Symmetry: C5
Subunit: 260 residues, 5 copies
């Protein structure tokens, strides 16, 4: 069949207000996350500096994405009466997220692995698989949702949703395997935290698919608003929550080593 | 009933001048506040680094908000004779404040708690309540004032004003409780300062509601000007004044620990 | 009576060239001043860090003001034949200075006081008076010159010129008093420098009123050009000259303390 | 003969989506590369600081280029029905790469040489030849592909392709010679890595010519998309991959010296 | 007589391509120069920190100038057939250089003097003369070439060319005198380098007048292209070459002092 695309829906003034607030709120929160990261980079040892590097990368990429989306949103809808009618630049209010996720879902994997205990081939092989898996999960989603069928084709969405979902599972398994192998070799406290971090990351990765279902199934202004609110909030929660948790695991691990 | 929205009023050239000066002055003052924060971050110990992190976050978010509002203001009113007539981008001269406050009212709570003495569950429980309470105070206000009724509906303003005000009290009580519990465990000097900081923060949070009353009751260019001047000044005073006070408390506390 | 405002005059191509060069030259010089400040912030002791903080603030605010004025100037005049005719954005080529001065005339006062010897109430009371006096000197000027009468009313200019001038004297007296009290307690060398710094600051503050007289008395393109050249040069000289002098005093004072 | 230029092709909405994603993804990845570089610059000794300087330069230049290309791309095609028709600014979506490569192909040469063992005239003479050779390889390509014939002339492309290719070989030989001379004087581990780095750099420099062949031979929207995807990916891989490898070599060399 | 100004010539697409590449290449190279400067500021002692300050200033000012010229160039010519016709904002593609040179020709003088041996009045008197001389050399050139006669008057160009040239000689003599006095008091190695630096700076200052001769004598698109290429290259060579040389002298002098 053929659903309308999420960036083709005219927005009521309320919906144009909500959609701006969450775009601006997310970009603001990610910029605070960047500043927190830089001000507290000294608390973590050089062994776990990959965490600092990843967290910074996630925040820098995500902050720019959300700046571009606020500017695209400002120039992507035109007021025509009581409604904001999408322009041609309206696709640049939702499509930039996939650019951000492409860099940030791989880095979140690397940031999780950084606190976990892995060495040699096992380390390298895990990282590459997790990066590769995560990137494809996102790129295949981008093809289905934006590129192929112009995001108006239900058939396309489903095929690439499935493909996307396969690469999710591949990627999830790899990260879950590695953490489980790494939990025994950690102090109880660390291993407790790293079990929580893994659950939080995987639970966060579960929300985003929901917003792809909206696109396959529902279509309208409220649904465009709901896709923004859902995805914006998920970013704020996952990117700020999980990255904080990993720094706690990494600060703890830093000290444990100093003890020894 | 139905009042006109604050961003729907045509401004006299005087009012368009005043409104710019205070938008630019506030953004300038907040940028100095950011630079002060970075140049003097070494005076505080790692125990109270949360203060540095919060203060930076408040200043970065607020500086961007006020940059966007000056640019929106520049492109949001069109001169038509002797008056500046608002465009559709004029709502982006007042609505960005709620994005800023959403991140900065929670952080001001965290910054106050950072100098106060609290630990364990009590700490976590207090912080989350204060963050959650503060965010809702702001978001409910944003719904009433901008999203619901397009900020033209007196009925909506009142309902969400009330709701907003409930979450204010919840949030205030939590912060006031915690400081009162924390005052005994501090040196007289510190506790003196932290009593002042609490009064200043709560007194500052009392001014902003005033500007919501203007919107419910009065409507016109002078009132749009008065809402900007009021809110801009309150930001400059609270954000620069209170954040300075907390660094003084945090610097003092840092030293006290050193002499122990 | 009535005079045309300084931003209502059509400019000859020569005058549009000169006026750009000095706007860009001043903003460039202030940006170098910022970089000098950051590269040489280590030469000053923590006792006089309120000089580094002030100097940075002056430079950051002034650099943004002059960026906005170059961009406003680029978009504020339209070429119509042989002359550049001012738009409605032309007022944003002169009005941003008052935003800059509002933050920078108070900070220059604080920066002077930082090297001088003041303690306790005397210190606090002096600083607040100097900040408050300096801000009102600028804001009252802004009312007379831009806000009240649209800067076309000779009567308004004179009233607020006078008011402005009252607050100048108040502010000057306070700063001059404090330095005179502080000169005896300093080493001869320092006190020599601090006497020069005070003269330079007060002499610099004398030039700016000249450009308000042009507005009261003369009107035309040559006069708009002369108001830019005068004010731009005064900024470059005062902001870069005086701030350098204070760092010399502050560096000297830092050493004196070390040798004790 | 004559071919349409790569920036003269109308793009399908899919192709306009793909082409944006890879422009934004590359600029995001290069910005992460910059942040990684600055967070990990302490791991390298002052002997090999040239590496840090080069890597930073590569990333700063490349990040700006790709920002300009995303903004040019946003303003360089106009939607006309089902297709995006190139404007006059469309040439600024492909031409900025040559500006980036002009600075970054020379620096990649310098970064390779920095870890290798070379001294005195031999060092200076090698660097200058490699810089000069690399710059001409790029500039001659820019003449053929953009400046001469407006990138529509097959004859021009071939002449400058050849010239370009001559300077490639000159440059390659010089870098390959120097590394071969340098491999014996390095520790086995280092020399292993530096052999890989040389292969990776030269292999990366082999991909870019492919995109020049497309231009000579094929012409159309899919080919414009294929030139972006090819060149964007090559940048991400070479700039992030090779620069990482050199830091590994540089970190290793740093330690080896510490041992001694 | 009368000649067309350099920014009044319509450019062929080739010439519009070349002129962009060199504007973007110069701005990119100056930004790398800034990053090099910051990454290697630790190699020089506090005695010669003026060098670091100058070099940074030169690079910051020049990088902004060339950003504002690439953006002016993008918005200063309109495609009209096969040619790019200059608009009104085309003078802002050549006039910003004089703003840059006004700050950077004085600083280059200060940077040369920083590594040379001068003290007391001789130092102060030399610096002020060199700064003053250099600024007037540039400003008088700006009057002749841009402001007076709109850069269309051969008579004006010649008068101010001559005046400009007088201040060049004054400035050159002062710098050459001081270096000659300073060469004896330096180690042979340092003095060798400082002799080269002086030749390089004065030789660089000789090229720029050539581009003023083009304007007096020749007029056309090729000549506009030749003025950009000449001036852009001269900036890249002088600003990056000379500033590097001075850091070498300054690093050497730093060490010499350490070994004493
Ligand atoms: C900071 C942003 C994060 C953590 C983003 C995560 C996004 C995903 C895990 C997306 C997953 C998807 C599927 C597995 C199926 C449908 C398409 C996607 C891309 C939304
Ligand atoms: C830096 C900005 C600060 C401290 C902002 C504070 C804002 C408030 C405390 C706002 C309170 C409100 C109410 C309790 C009722 C009406 C709606 C609000 C949001 C203005
Ligand atoms: C960095 C900028 C500085 C030091 C600006 C100083 C400006 C003044 C001292 C302005 C004084 C004025 C009067 C006392 C009367 C007329 C109005 C003013 C504001 C120009
Ligand atoms: C970071 C970017 C890099 C490493 C770019 C490298 C580009 C080249 C080695 C380009 C080579 C070319 C030829 C030898 C043939 C003609 C076309 C060129 C310029 C693409
Ligand atoms: C970084 C830029 C530099 C070193 C610029 C130097 C420019 C000059 C030395 C200009 C000299 C000129 C004359 C002496 C004659 C007339 C033309 C001028 C103004 C370009
Ligand atoms: C390397 C990335 C390649 C992506 C290919 C996507 C092709 C989509 C074609 C859409 C046609 C309608
Ligand atoms: C009409 C207003 C639409 C609001 C949509 C809210 C979506 C909430 C998702 C969680
Ligand atoms: C987080 C979820 C936000 C939901 C906001 C709902 C607003 C509804 C507005 C209805 C307008 C008619
Ligand atoms: C607080 C700042 C208040 C400024 C008041 C200025 C009033 C101007 C009135 C203009 C009337 C015409
Ligand atoms: C202070 C000097 C002001 C000079 C102004 C020159 C104006 C020229 C007009 C053609
Ligand atoms: C550094 C000098 C570069 C000169 C390039 C010359 C290109 C000539 C183009 C001619 C077009 C017809
Ligand atoms: C490797 C590059 C592949 C590019 C494919 C682009 C297809 C565009 C859709 C037609
Ligand atoms: C510092 C003051 C600079 C003044 C420059 C004066 C230039 C006057 C040019 C007049 C042009 C008339 C056509
Ligand atoms: C300094 C060399 C200048 C070369 C200019 C080339 C102009 C090309 C016009 C076609």
């Amino acid at each position: 069949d053929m659903i309308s695309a999420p960036w083709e829906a005219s927005l009521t003034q309320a919906e144009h207000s909500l959609i701006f607030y969450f775009l601006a709120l997310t970009g603001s929160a990610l910029l605070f996350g960047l500043a927190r990261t830089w001000l507290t980079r000294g608390e973590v040892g050089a062994r776990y500096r990959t965490a600092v590097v990843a967290r910074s990368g996630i925040m820098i990429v995500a902050t720019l994405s959300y700046v571009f989306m606020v500017l695209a949103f400002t120039s992507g809808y035109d007021h025509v009466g009581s409604l904001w009618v999408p322009n041609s630049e309206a696709i640049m209010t939702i499509a930039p997220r996939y650019v951000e996720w492409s860099i940030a879902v791989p880095l979140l994997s690397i940031e999780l692995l950084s606190v976990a205990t892995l060495s040699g081939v096992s380390a390298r092989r895990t990282r590459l698989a997790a990066v590769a898996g995560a990137f494809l999960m996102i790129f295949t989603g981008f093809l289905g949702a934006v590129v192929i069928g112009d995001g108006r084709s239900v058939g396309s969405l489903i095929i690439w949703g499935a493909i996307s979902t396969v690469f999710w599972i591949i990627t999830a398994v790899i990260l879950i395997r590695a953490i489980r192998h790494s939990l025994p070799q950690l102090t109880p406290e660390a291993a407790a935290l790293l079990k929580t971090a893994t659950i939080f990351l995987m639970s966060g990765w579960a929300v985003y698919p929901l917003a792809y279902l909206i696109q396959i199934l529902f279509a309208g202004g409220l649904w465009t608003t709901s896709i923004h609110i859902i995805l914006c909030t998920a970013d704020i929660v996952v990117k700020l929550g999980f990255c904080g948790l990993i720094h706690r695991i990494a600060k703890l691990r830093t000290a444990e080593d100093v003890r020894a």
